[PDB]
Amino acid sequence: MGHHHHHHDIIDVNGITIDKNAFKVTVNGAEIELTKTEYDLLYLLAENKNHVMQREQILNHVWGYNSEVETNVVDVYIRYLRNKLKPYDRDKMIETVRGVGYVIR
Numbered sequence: 215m216g217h218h219h220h221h222h223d224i225i226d227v228n229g230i231t232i233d234k235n236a237f238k239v240t241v242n243g244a245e246i247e248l249t250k251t252e253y254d255l256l257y258l259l260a261e262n263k264n265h266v267m268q269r270e271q272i273l274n275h276v277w278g279y280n281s282e283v284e285t286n287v288v289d290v291y292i293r294y295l296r297n298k299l300k301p302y303d304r305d306k307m308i309e310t311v312r313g314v315g316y317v318i319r
Contacts (some may be wrong), residue, residue, distance in 0.1 A: 227318055228261040241302045248298070251276055255291055259308060259318050268315035292316050294314050 222235035231240040237253060239246040248256060254276040259267055270291075273285040295303035309319045 225257065225260045227263045228304070229302070230256075230260055230304060230307070232257055232260055241304055244302065246298060246302070251291060252295060252298070255288070255295055259316060263318040264316055266311055266317040270315075272315060288315070 230258040269288040270285040299305035
């Protein structure tokens, strides 16, 4: 009785705990509510924490499912992510890479 990776592959990156099966995000036990897009954004960054996520790479995974939007939309939504991560000081986790994308340091 403790933790299980099966049935619910949870991601733990720099204080963040993403529930993939419950679609909930936690830090410090606090439950953050993300959207279909914003959850996909954070999850993408979290799982690929050590990988610099190009805007279009994010754009292609999150928006890649019938959206037809400019990849700069990603930057915009990431900014909103920061806002929601502010109370948890997790906004700093998303490092901006000008011309490339975003990454979790």
